[PDB]
């Protein structure tokens, strides 16, 4: 409807796949080459389904900060025959707050879904499903089940992936450029 939705759509149409694990269907953001991200609670194993195609997982790393605290991001390298468009230049370098974000989801259940979530706070610490978690972004939107892995963007930046909510607020794990240096 506006330039926020324009940038979100541009990311969704080229840099997302539908990922299916034994824990459900997730929006999955492809970042560069065959490297993608997904919430760690997706529990990626040796095989994952990508757009309903059986795909070998070449590597999967559940990220933690240097305090050894959960970040709720898993970086997956996929045995896919095609590279993602490289979007690492849209990732923030530092932890920050943002104005006017969009949460975008694409699954069987929620195709072509875009939500204007408004202001995004650097929330920091969250007890997420009982697990201490750092680098959390918060937005005042009542997100539900089905949105995990959704991409959080501003104009020009990809800032996070949706990992949970409390019925009133939604929570995203930060994406930082430093996670994807090769
Ligand atoms: C994904 N949530 C959803 C889905 C269908 C209808 C309404 C909603 S909402 C975000 O407005 O509570």
């Amino acid at each position: 409807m506006g330039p926020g939705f324009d940038f979100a759509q541009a990311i969704m149409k080229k840099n997302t796949v539908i990922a299916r694990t034994e824990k459900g269907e997730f929006t999955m953001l492809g970042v560069y080459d065959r490297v993608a991200v997904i919430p760690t609670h997706a529990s990626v194993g040796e095989i994952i389904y990508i757009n309903d195609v059986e795909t070998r997982v070449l590597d999967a790393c559940a990220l933690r900060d240097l305090t050894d605290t959960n970040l709720e991001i898993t970086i997956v390298k996929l045995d896919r025959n095609q590279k993602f468009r490289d979007i690492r230049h849209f990732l923030p370098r530092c932890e920050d707050d943002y104005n006017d974000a969009v949460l975008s989801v694409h699954t069987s259940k929620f195709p072509n879904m875009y939500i204007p979530v408004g202001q995004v706070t650097n929330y920091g610490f969250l007890n997420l499903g009982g697990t201490p978690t750092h680098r959390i972004l918060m937005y005042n939107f009542p997100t539900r089940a089905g949105q995990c892995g959704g991409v959080v963007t501003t104009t020009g930046k990809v800032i996070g992936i949706h990992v949970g909510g409390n019925g009133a607020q939604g929570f995203a794990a930060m994406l930082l450029h430093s996670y994807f240096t090769d």
Side-chain angles (χ1 to χ4, degrees):
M1 247 192 187
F5 293 105
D6 195 33
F7 181 79
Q9 183 175 255
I11 298 294
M12 296 307 284
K13 284 175 173 285
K14 291 288 169 173
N15 280 82
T16 65
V17 298
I18 303 178
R20 175 175 285 277
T21 68
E22 292 177 332
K23 316 260 144 100
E25 250 181 16
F26 296 88
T27 302
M28 165 177 269
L29 177 74
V31 179
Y32 75 104
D33 296 342
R34 298 168 290 168
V35 176
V37 290
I38 190 170
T40 300
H41 71 253
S43 302
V44 176
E46 296 301 315
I47 301 170
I48 190 162
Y49 269 58
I50 302 294
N51 297 338
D52 284 310
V53 176
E54 186 187 1
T55 304
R56 282 188 293 272
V57 172
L58 299 170
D59 190 56
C61 176
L63 300 182
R64 305 185 66 92
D65 74 11
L66 297 184
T67 70
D68 192 28
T69 306
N70 181 46
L71 293 170
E72 200 51 24
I73 302 289
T74 291
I75 305 180
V76 181
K77 200 162 161 187
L78 299 170
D79 198 6
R80 199 145 176 263
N81 67 359
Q82 182 181 171
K83 296 174 183 62
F84 298 114
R85 174 199 186 188
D86 189 341
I87 57 166
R88 287 179 286 187
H89 57 288
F90 299 133
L91 301 170
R93 265 137 202 243
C94 54
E95 305 187 12
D96 210 356
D97 312 292
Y98 298 92
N99 304 308
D100 194 19
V102 173
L103 167 62
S104 51
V105 165
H106 189 82
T107 64
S108 300
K109 178 181 201 164
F110 292 148
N112 304 300
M113 167 184 290
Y114 300 81
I115 306 170
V117 296
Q119 273 187 7
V120 180
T121 309
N122 176 6
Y123 190 88
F125 172 85
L126 179 68
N127 190 352
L128 175 66
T131 300
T133 305
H134 285 168
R135 285 193 180 145
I136 293 292
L137 298 165
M138 182 272 287
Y139 28 90
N140 285 299
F141 190 87
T143 53
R144 288 96 163 288
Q147 284 141 226
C148 289
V151 186
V152 187
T153 59
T154 66
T155 69
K157 292 179 261 52
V158 177
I159 68 171
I161 61 168
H162 187 78
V163 298
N166 60 24
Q169 294 168 315
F171 297 107
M174 288 175 186
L175 294 170
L176 297 177
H177 185 91
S178 53
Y179 296 165
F180 306 99
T181 68
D182 42 353

PDB file of all heavy atoms in Angstrom, residues 38-53:
ATOM      1  N   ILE A  38      15.994 -19.389  10.396  1.00  0.00           N
ATOM      2  CA  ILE A  38      14.678 -19.891  10.872  1.00  0.00           C
ATOM      3  C   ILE A  38      14.747 -19.820  12.392  1.00  0.00           C
ATOM      4  O   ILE A  38      15.833 -19.866  12.948  1.00  0.00           O
ATOM      5  CB  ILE A  38      14.457 -21.329  10.369  1.00  0.00           C
ATOM      6  CG1 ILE A  38      13.019 -21.836  10.606  1.00  0.00           C
ATOM      7  CG2 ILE A  38      15.497 -22.292  10.930  1.00  0.00           C
ATOM      8  CD1 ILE A  38      12.712 -23.138   9.917  1.00  0.00           C
ATOM      9  N   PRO A  39      13.634 -19.703  13.123  1.00  0.00           N
ATOM     10  CA  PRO A  39      13.686 -19.730  14.591  1.00  0.00           C
ATOM     11  C   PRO A  39      14.217 -21.089  15.068  1.00  0.00           C
ATOM     12  O   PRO A  39      13.957 -22.151  14.508  1.00  0.00           O
ATOM     13  CB  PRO A  39      12.231 -19.518  14.991  1.00  0.00           C
ATOM     14  CG  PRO A  39      11.710 -18.649  13.845  1.00  0.00           C
ATOM     15  CD  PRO A  39      12.282 -19.390  12.647  1.00  0.00           C
ATOM     16  N   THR A  40      15.049 -21.041  16.120  1.00  0.00           N
ATOM     17  CA  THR A  40      15.687 -22.257  16.640  1.00  0.00           C
ATOM     18  C   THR A  40      14.620 -23.253  17.124  1.00  0.00           C
ATOM     19  O   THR A  40      14.843 -24.474  16.923  1.00  0.00           O
ATOM     20  CB  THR A  40      16.670 -21.895  17.765  1.00  0.00           C
ATOM     21  OG1 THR A  40      17.646 -21.024  17.193  1.00  0.00           O
ATOM     22  CG2 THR A  40      17.334 -23.106  18.359  1.00  0.00           C
ATOM     23  N   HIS A  41      13.477 -22.789  17.612  1.00  0.00           N
ATOM     24  CA  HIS A  41      12.396 -23.727  18.036  1.00  0.00           C
ATOM     25  C   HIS A  41      11.788 -24.524  16.865  1.00  0.00           C
ATOM     26  O   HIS A  41      10.982 -25.463  17.114  1.00  0.00           O
ATOM     27  CB  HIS A  41      11.353 -22.995  18.831  1.00  0.00           C
ATOM     28  CG  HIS A  41      10.496 -22.047  18.070  1.00  0.00           C
ATOM     29  ND1 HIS A  41      10.647 -20.686  18.191  1.00  0.00           N
ATOM     30  CD2 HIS A  41       9.368 -22.243  17.358  1.00  0.00           C
ATOM     31  CE1 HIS A  41       9.687 -20.093  17.506  1.00  0.00           C
ATOM     32  NE2 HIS A  41       8.908 -21.013  16.986  1.00  0.00           N
ATOM     33  N   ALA A  42      12.119 -24.237  15.611  1.00  0.00           N
ATOM     34  CA  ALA A  42      11.741 -25.104  14.475  1.00  0.00           C
ATOM     35  C   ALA A  42      12.422 -26.465  14.546  1.00  0.00           C
ATOM     36  O   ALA A  42      11.963 -27.392  13.843  1.00  0.00           O
ATOM     37  CB  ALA A  42      12.059 -24.403  13.174  1.00  0.00           C
ATOM     38  N   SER A  43      13.511 -26.585  15.308  1.00  0.00           N
ATOM     39  CA  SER A  43      14.265 -27.846  15.516  1.00  0.00           C
ATOM     40  C   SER A  43      14.700 -28.476  14.203  1.00  0.00           C
ATOM     41  O   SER A  43      14.345 -29.652  13.886  1.00  0.00           O
ATOM     42  CB  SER A  43      13.456 -28.841  16.335  1.00  0.00           C
ATOM     43  OG  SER A  43      13.128 -28.258  17.584  1.00  0.00           O
ATOM     44  N   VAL A  44      15.489 -27.751  13.427  1.00  0.00           N
ATOM     45  CA  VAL A  44      15.976 -28.254  12.128  1.00  0.00           C
ATOM     46  C   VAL A  44      16.802 -29.517  12.372  1.00  0.00           C
ATOM     47  O   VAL A  44      17.712 -29.500  13.218  1.00  0.00           O
ATOM     48  CB  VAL A  44      16.810 -27.157  11.436  1.00  0.00           C
ATOM     49  CG1 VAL A  44      17.420 -27.658  10.127  1.00  0.00           C
ATOM     50  CG2 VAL A  44      15.976 -25.901  11.210  1.00  0.00           C
ATOM     51  N   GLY A  45      16.546 -30.545  11.587  1.00  0.00           N
ATOM     52  CA  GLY A  45      17.361 -31.766  11.561  1.00  0.00           C
ATOM     53  C   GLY A  45      18.183 -31.898  10.294  1.00  0.00           C
ATOM     54  O   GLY A  45      18.659 -30.857   9.768  1.00  0.00           O
ATOM     55  N   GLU A  46      18.501 -33.146   9.915  1.00  0.00           N
ATOM     56  CA  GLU A  46      19.383 -33.479   8.781  1.00  0.00           C
ATOM     57  C   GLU A  46      18.652 -33.278   7.442  1.00  0.00           C
ATOM     58  O   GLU A  46      19.324 -33.190   6.435  1.00  0.00           O
ATOM     59  CB  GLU A  46      19.837 -34.950   8.860  1.00  0.00           C
ATOM     60  CG  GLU A  46      20.699 -35.263  10.077  1.00  0.00           C
ATOM     61  CD  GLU A  46      21.993 -34.480  10.213  1.00  0.00           C
ATOM     62  OE1 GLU A  46      22.723 -34.337   9.195  1.00  0.00           O
ATOM     63  OE2 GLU A  46      22.289 -34.021  11.355  1.00  0.00           O
ATOM     64  N   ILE A  47      17.328 -33.365   7.451  1.00  0.00           N
ATOM     65  CA  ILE A  47      16.404 -33.208   6.287  1.00  0.00           C
ATOM     66  C   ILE A  47      15.318 -32.185   6.650  1.00  0.00           C
ATOM     67  O   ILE A  47      14.822 -32.153   7.787  1.00  0.00           O
ATOM     68  CB  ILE A  47      15.809 -34.556   5.857  1.00  0.00           C
ATOM     69  CG1 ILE A  47      16.909 -35.541   5.481  1.00  0.00           C
ATOM     70  CG2 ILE A  47      14.802 -34.381   4.718  1.00  0.00           C
ATOM     71  CD1 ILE A  47      16.434 -36.933   5.280  1.00  0.00           C
ATOM     72  N   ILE A  48      15.049 -31.279   5.713  1.00  0.00           N
ATOM     73  CA  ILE A  48      13.971 -30.278   5.855  1.00  0.00           C
ATOM     74  C   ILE A  48      13.193 -30.240   4.529  1.00  0.00           C
ATOM     75  O   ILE A  48      13.752 -30.644   3.478  1.00  0.00           O
ATOM     76  CB  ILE A  48      14.579 -28.915   6.231  1.00  0.00           C
ATOM     77  CG1 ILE A  48      13.545 -27.870   6.631  1.00  0.00           C
ATOM     78  CG2 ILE A  48      15.446 -28.382   5.077  1.00  0.00           C
ATOM     79  CD1 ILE A  48      14.108 -26.686   7.391  1.00  0.00           C
ATOM     80  N   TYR A  49      11.924 -29.821   4.558  1.00  0.00           N
ATOM     81  CA  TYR A  49      11.170 -29.612   3.303  1.00  0.00           C
ATOM     82  C   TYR A  49      11.187 -28.123   2.975  1.00  0.00           C
ATOM     83  O   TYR A  49      10.983 -27.296   3.863  1.00  0.00           O
ATOM     84  CB  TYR A  49       9.761 -30.196   3.415  1.00  0.00           C
ATOM     85  CG  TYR A  49       9.711 -31.636   2.954  1.00  0.00           C
ATOM     86  CD1 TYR A  49      10.501 -32.590   3.555  1.00  0.00           C
ATOM     87  CD2 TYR A  49       8.898 -32.052   1.910  1.00  0.00           C
ATOM     88  CE1 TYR A  49      10.489 -33.922   3.169  1.00  0.00           C
ATOM     89  CE2 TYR A  49       8.866 -33.382   1.504  1.00  0.00           C
ATOM     90  CZ  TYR A  49       9.651 -34.320   2.154  1.00  0.00           C
ATOM     91  OH  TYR A  49       9.661 -35.632   1.784  1.00  0.00           O
ATOM     92  N   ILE A  50      11.563 -27.780   1.748  1.00  0.00           N
ATOM     93  CA  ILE A  50      11.695 -26.405   1.253  1.00  0.00           C
ATOM     94  C   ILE A  50      10.733 -26.310   0.058  1.00  0.00           C
ATOM     95  O   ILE A  50      10.958 -26.992  -0.960  1.00  0.00           O
ATOM     96  CB  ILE A  50      13.144 -26.070   0.847  1.00  0.00           C
ATOM     97  CG1 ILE A  50      14.135 -26.260   1.994  1.00  0.00           C
ATOM     98  CG2 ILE A  50      13.245 -24.670   0.243  1.00  0.00           C
ATOM     99  CD1 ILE A  50      13.953 -25.318   3.134  1.00  0.00           C
ATOM    100  N   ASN A  51       9.671 -25.519   0.176  1.00  0.00           N
ATOM    101  CA  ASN A  51       8.622 -25.449  -0.885  1.00  0.00           C
ATOM    102  C   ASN A  51       8.212 -26.881  -1.228  1.00  0.00           C
ATOM    103  O   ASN A  51       8.090 -27.168  -2.417  1.00  0.00           O
ATOM    104  CB  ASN A  51       9.115 -24.605  -2.059  1.00  0.00           C
ATOM    105  CG  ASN A  51       9.388 -23.159  -1.709  1.00  0.00           C
ATOM    106  OD1 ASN A  51       8.865 -22.641  -0.724  1.00  0.00           O
ATOM    107  ND2 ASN A  51      10.197 -22.508  -2.535  1.00  0.00           N
ATOM    108  N   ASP A  52       8.032 -27.740  -0.225  1.00  0.00           N
ATOM    109  CA  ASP A  52       7.516 -29.131  -0.360  1.00  0.00           C
ATOM    110  C   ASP A  52       8.500 -30.039  -1.103  1.00  0.00           C
ATOM    111  O   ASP A  52       8.076 -31.125  -1.522  1.00  0.00           O
ATOM    112  CB  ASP A  52       6.123 -29.128  -1.015  1.00  0.00           C
ATOM    113  CG  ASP A  52       5.091 -28.674   0.011  1.00  0.00           C
ATOM    114  OD1 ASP A  52       5.095 -29.240   1.143  1.00  0.00           O
ATOM    115  OD2 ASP A  52       4.346 -27.719  -0.288  1.00  0.00           O
ATOM    116  N   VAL A  53       9.778 -29.679  -1.173  1.00  0.00           N
ATOM    117  CA  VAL A  53      10.844 -30.551  -1.734  1.00  0.00           C
ATOM    118  C   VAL A  53      11.810 -30.997  -0.632  1.00  0.00           C
ATOM    119  O   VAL A  53      12.343 -30.160   0.156  1.00  0.00           O
ATOM    120  CB  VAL A  53      11.560 -29.832  -2.873  1.00  0.00           C
ATOM    121  CG1 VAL A  53      12.723 -30.631  -3.430  1.00  0.00           C
ATOM    122  CG2 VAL A  53      10.525 -29.485  -3.946  1.00  0.00           C
TER     123      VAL A  53
END
